[PDB]
């Protein structure tokens, strides 16, 4: 039908920043469905975006964010994607201003691993795994998001030579330029675990360009305070943060791991999520005044 | 629905024809059953340019201009959903019949075409590829401008574009010369198109395009292959369109007031010509 994008979608306040554009809350008028729309400038390189969109379409999982459609308004591309009420793990940490406790981390990580396992089965590498790109259901289920820099592998033994991602979370092999597998994501997950636990990635204080050079050379990162963390969690991170890819555990293996195995159900998350929202609203209500 | 797969949303049928940057396929919207024409564009193609084409279509709201319904991504391809015209392009109509258009048919088509141009120019956009191929007829016989692949926008109504683009036979002299050109450039194409409808091909058509492009700026304005057949009014109209200098060339609005355009019969006359083409088309199937 000849219906404009505004006719189709009623657009609310911007949620946050997507990899290529800001992301906005929106409603689908015909169904009353809530969706997230990312507005991308025409200036941005489209070919890369099309590739990102294709990967999302290929994916069909509860742990991966769905792509619904795209529209053109003015001279911009709007990409319509599944909406997660809770927001990014990073957002939840920021609103509460409290880092996650181990039980929360384990439950979230377990869901993320199931998502990674799906992507990996599908021979795709996310390449940007970080807390910001892990998204939560109001129900508290976790999904992988923002496959802006994601890559595809032809075969089990195929590798990618491209160096891309967010530097703090980037695998050393990726930096080394040897070429790498899906396993690169697993290292990134390890940095993320630290991120949830301590609220920032290692080397966060140093400039990203300086940091990128250091990572291959340096020994694997460790908790700032070892004393605080449990044996299972410490091991799980230790396993993720292995410099040499062959040594590093797969997502399938990790799910077997005790820290993941004993992880509590998504319900335990609910109070934390509720708090994050109420904090969000108050800031919103304060914003109205 | 909102999350439905691209195959789910649209049923795609036979390829209608060829449009710039891709090929156009007949499709049926499953929800409404409405019929649309969808053009499939390669990812490797210059999307930034394509986005520009789509926005121009969105900006237009005319009976005389083809309508943009939306786009979707399947595979790596970008699919553009556009209004479907049953009659097809004038070129299709000429080709299927194998008969060139009579004066009465031509004037009626031009009037709608001129009306479309007048609107386009009002919005300060130059189509830049006006040809029989790009003029589309619905079953009713109303005519619409179709292809916006090379279409250009003027930042200011005063402003001009130096870009050299289009299909070479229909190209205006001002464009071929690197001197700046505006909306009036379309009118020249309109003149070439009128000849094309009468003779079934453009002037120089049997000649090589590179050879022709060089000639056009230097050369005298084109004339009917046999002048005897054509009327005084049609002859004058073509001459007004085909003026080497942009400044002395007529505006679309001026052309609408022109006698050949003014005396045009209603679209109802077109009915016999359209029917024959469609009837022919079914038989070939
Ligand atoms: C689809 N999507 C994304 O791709 C990405 S990737 C990085 C961020 C996003 N964003 C912004 C999103 N935020 C949401 N939902 C959501 C819900 C609440 C909030 S909050 N913390 O401002 O209340 C943010 C995002 N849902 C989905 C996304
Ligand atoms: C939207 N559109 C176009 O943009 C353009 S521009 C140049 C060509 C087109 N095409 C291919 C089209 N053909 C149609 N409809 C249509 C219907 C019948 C036939 S025919 N002559 O094969 O029976 C051709 C096109 N409808 C629309 C188009
Ligand atoms: Cl399970």
Swiss-Prot record, chain A:
Residues that hold Mg(2+) according to the record: 133, 146
Ranges of residues in domain Protein kinase: 9-260
Catalytic site: 128
Binding-site residues for ATP, renumbered to this chain: 15-23, 38
Organism domain of life: Eukaryota
Residues found modified as Phosphothreonine: 99, 156, 162
Protein name as annotated: Serine/threonine-protein kinase 3 36kDa subunit
Residues of the full protein shown: 19 to 307 of 491
From Swiss-Prot, chain B:
The organism's place on the tree of life at top rank: Eukaryota
Positions annotated to bind Mg(2+): 134, 147
Effect on the protein of changing residue 43 to L: In an ovarian clear cell carcinoma sample; somatic mutation
Enzyme active site: 129
Organism: Homo sapiens
Annotated consequence of substituting residue 163 to A: Loss of kinase activity. Loss of interaction with SLMAP
Lineage: Eukaryota, Metazoa, Chordata, Craniata, Vertebrata
Residues of the full protein shown: 18 to 302 of 491
Domain Protein kinase: 10-261
Annotated consequence of substituting residue 129 to N: Loss of kinase activity
Positions contributing to ATP binding: 16-24, 39
Effect of residue 39 to R: Loss of kinase activity. Loss of interaction with components of the STRIPAK complex
Residue list for modification Phosphothreonine: 100, 157, 163
Protein name per Swiss-Prot or TrEMBL: Serine/threonine-protein kinase 3 36kDa subunit
């Amino acid at each position: 039908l000849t219906k404009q994008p505004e006719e189709v979608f009623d657009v609310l306040e911007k949620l946050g920043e997507g990899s290529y554009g800001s992301v906005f809350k929106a409603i689908h008028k015909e169904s009353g469905q809530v969706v997230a729309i990312k507005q991308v400038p025409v200036e941005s390189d489209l070919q890369e975006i099309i590739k990102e969109i294709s990967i999302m379409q290929q994916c069909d999982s509860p742990y991966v964010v769905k792509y619904y459609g795209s529209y053109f308004k003015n001279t911009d591309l709007w990409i319509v994607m599944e909406y997660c009420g809770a927001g990014s793990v990073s957002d939840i940490i920021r609103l509460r201003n409290k880092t996650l406790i181990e039980d929360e981390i384990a439950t979230i990580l377990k869901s993320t691993l199931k998502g990674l396992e799906y992507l990996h089965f599908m021979r795709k590498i996310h390449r940007d795994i970080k807390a910001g790109n892990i998204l939560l259901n109001t129900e508290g289920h976790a999904k992988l998001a923002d496959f802006g820099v994601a890559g595809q592998l032809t075969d089990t033994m195929a590798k990618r030579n491209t160096v891309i991602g967010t530097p703090f979370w980037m695998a050393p092999e990726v930096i080394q330029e040897i070429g790498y597998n899906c396993v690169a994501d697993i290292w990134s997950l390890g940095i993320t675990s630290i991120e949830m636990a301590e609220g920032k990635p290692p080397y966060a204080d140093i400039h990203p360009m300086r940091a990128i050079f250091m990572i291959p050379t340096n020994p694997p990162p460790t908790f700032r305070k070892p004393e605080l963390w449990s044996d299972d969690f410490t091991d799980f991170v230790k396993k993720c943060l292995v410099k040499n890819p062959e040594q590093r555990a797969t997502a399938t293996q990790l799910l077997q791991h005790p820290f993941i195995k004993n992880a509590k159900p998504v319900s335990i998350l609910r109070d934390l999520i509720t708090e994050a929202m109420e904090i969000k609203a108050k800031r919103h209500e304060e914003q109205q005044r």
